[PDB]
Amino acid sequence: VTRIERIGAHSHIRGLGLDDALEPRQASQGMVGQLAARRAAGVVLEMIREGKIAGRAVLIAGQPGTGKTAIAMGMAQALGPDTPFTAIAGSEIFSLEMSKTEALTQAFRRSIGVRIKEETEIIEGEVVEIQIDKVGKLTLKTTEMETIYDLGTKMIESLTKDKVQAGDVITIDKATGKISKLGRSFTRARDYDAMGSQTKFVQCPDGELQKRKEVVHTVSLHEIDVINSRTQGFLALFSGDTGEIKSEVREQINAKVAEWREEGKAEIIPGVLFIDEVHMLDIESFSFLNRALESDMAPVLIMATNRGITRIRGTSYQSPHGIPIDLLDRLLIVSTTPYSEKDTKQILRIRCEEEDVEMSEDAYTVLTRIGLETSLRYAIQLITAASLVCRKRKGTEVQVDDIKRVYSLFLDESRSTQYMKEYQ
Amino acid sequence: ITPGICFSTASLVLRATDVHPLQRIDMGRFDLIGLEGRVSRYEADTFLPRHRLSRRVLLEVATAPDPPPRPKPVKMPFYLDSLEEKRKRQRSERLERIFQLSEAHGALAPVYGTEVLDFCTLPQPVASPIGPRSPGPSHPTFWTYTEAAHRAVLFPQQRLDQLSEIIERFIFVMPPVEAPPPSLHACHPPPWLAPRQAAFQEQLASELWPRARPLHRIVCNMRTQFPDLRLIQYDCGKLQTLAVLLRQLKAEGHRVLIFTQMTRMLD
C-alpha cells in the first residue's frame, strides 16, 4: 500500500542524530557528517525546547548540496508535534492580498503554539418525550437513569429551532448551545430508503447523565483570525482577511492569552520558524525582522541561504548572504562544510537503503566518484534511475554497467551546458 | 425604464451540464469545512469511539419492542417461501445499509471543534471603543466601558438620522437609463431549476428586506425626482409681491378677499 507521503528528498532524515550531550555521531538516525553544523543545530534545538528567551535567529550557510535543508528537516523531525515547526520558503510571503510584512507577522504568530484546556458540565441522554404548551417538559434517558426537566423560553425556542425528536441523543451545556450531537437511537428502518447526511444513529450513551468534559486542543497564536470577522472559523481555511488590525492583534489577543495563562486555562508553547531560501526576501522584510526579533514573544528563526557575496533584491548593494548587515548582526551563523569521498558514499548508501536498493560495492564506488565530480543530488537521483533500469533488466542488484547506462541517459548541469554548443 | 429586457437566449442543453446522479462521488466523506460549526470536539474525540453502533447490537435491536410505562405515584392460503426469503434478504440489505451509512457519517472529526471555536471567540467587539453586551455589573466588562465614549461612535442608523436634513435636498441624481430585473433566461430548463432560485429569493427577501427599510428614503430620491414646490416661485415676481402683500396684511388680523377666473388658476 502507498501512503500520501511516500519517500522524498529528505525522507531519510528521521530526526537529528545527536547524543545525550549533543555530541554529533558519524553515522546516526538519517543525518551523516557535518559534525559542527549538526552540533550547532542541536544547541539551537535545545534552546528551542527551553523556550525561555525570544528573538533568536540562526542562519545555516553553505554551498548547495551540503545539507542545510537536511539539518532543517532533522530539527523538524526531532521536534515532535508538541511544538509548532512552521517551515515556509523565502517566496511564500510575496502575496497579493497580504503585504510583505503582514505575511511575516502571520508566519510568526503561526509558530507560537497554545494548548487550550476547557472544562464544561454537560447533560447527555436519549430524548424520550418533549411536551410543550409557553412552557413544557423534557424526558431525557440513559441506561443509568431517566430524568425530567422543565423548559424555559430560550430552551424551548432552541429545541424547536433544532427540531429534536424522540430518541435523539441531545446534548445540553450551561449557557445552552444545545449541540444535537448524535442522531436517533431508535425509530430505525429509515435506511429502507435513505438517511440524512447528518444522521449517525449510534446507540444511546451509558453511565451517568451529567458529566464534566475536559477537552485539550493545541491551536496557534494566529487565532486572531478566529476573531477578526463575524464568522471567523471560515476564514481559517482559506486566504482570509488581507490583514488583521494591529490594534487587536498585538494587544487584545496577547492580553487575553496572558490572562488565560494566569488563570491556568491555557499555556503558550513557542516553536520554530524555518525560512528556507531567505535570500529572496526584500530589504523591507529584513528591516521588519530587525525589529520583529526585538518583540516580546517572537519565535526562533532558522534561515538557509546558499548565496555568497551577492546583490540584495530591491537594491544594488552587495552583502554577505545577500541580506543586510544590520540583520546579519542579530543572527547566529552556522557553516556547513562540503561532503567528502567518505561522507558522500555514506549518504548515498543511506539513500539506497531508503528504497531498499541492493547496490554492489563497485556500483557504490562509481556512483560516489560520479557525484563528487558533478553533484550530490544528481548521484542521489541516479540511485533510483539505475534501480529502475535494472528492475527492467530482470535484475536484483544494481551494478556499474547499469549505473553508467543511466549516467549516459540522463545528463547533469555541467554536461548539459557543455553540449549546449549548437545554440539552436 | 428599458422595456427590452436583454434576456439570455442561450441553448437548453447547457442550463445544467454537471448534473449527473450516477456519475458523481460522495464528497460528503471529505467535508471538513462543514464540521467546524456543527460538530463538537467531545463528539468525535470521546463519544463516537466508545459508542459506535456495533453490527451485533444493530442486529439484536431488530426484535419485538416493549410498551412504555404508565406511572401514577403520588407517594414518597399459505405464504410463499421465495417471497419471505426475498423479504428477509432485503431486510438484511437494509440493516447493512444503516450499518454502513451510520459509520460513514461519523468517520472524520472537526479540525478545531465547537468548544474550541467558542473558547477562542471573544466578545464580538474585540478592539472597538464600545464595550460588549454585559449581563450586569457583576463583572468587569460592565464597569470597564463608558457611555460617554459609547456616544462617540455613531451607527449607520444615527448617521442616516443626522444626514436626513441634507439627504432630502441633495440626493437628486437620476440614472440616465433604468433596466428591469437583470436578465431572464429563455430555455427548456430542468423543472428543478426555477423552484430553487425562487426559494432562495424568497428567503433573502424575508431575511434582509426588512433590514433595508431605512435606505428606502434614499432609494426614493435616487429613483424619482419632483419639482421643489418653489421652482418657479423663486422667480415669479407677481407671486413674490402677492406673498409680500399677504404677509404685510396678515399682521393686521383682518379678512382678505382674492379673485380668480380659471378653475386651473384656482387649482
Binding site: 443509568e144 437513569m145 431517566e146 451517568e208 | 406511572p71 405515584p73
Partner: peptide, 18 residues
C-alpha cells in the same frame, strides 16, 4: 445514579401489587 433504579424496583413492585 442507581437511586433511580432502586426507586424503579419499588414502584414496579407497588404497581404489580395494585
Amino acid at each position: 445514579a442507581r437511586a433511580f433504579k432502586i426507586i424503579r424496583e419499588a414502584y414496579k413492585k407497588y404497581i404489580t401489587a395494585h
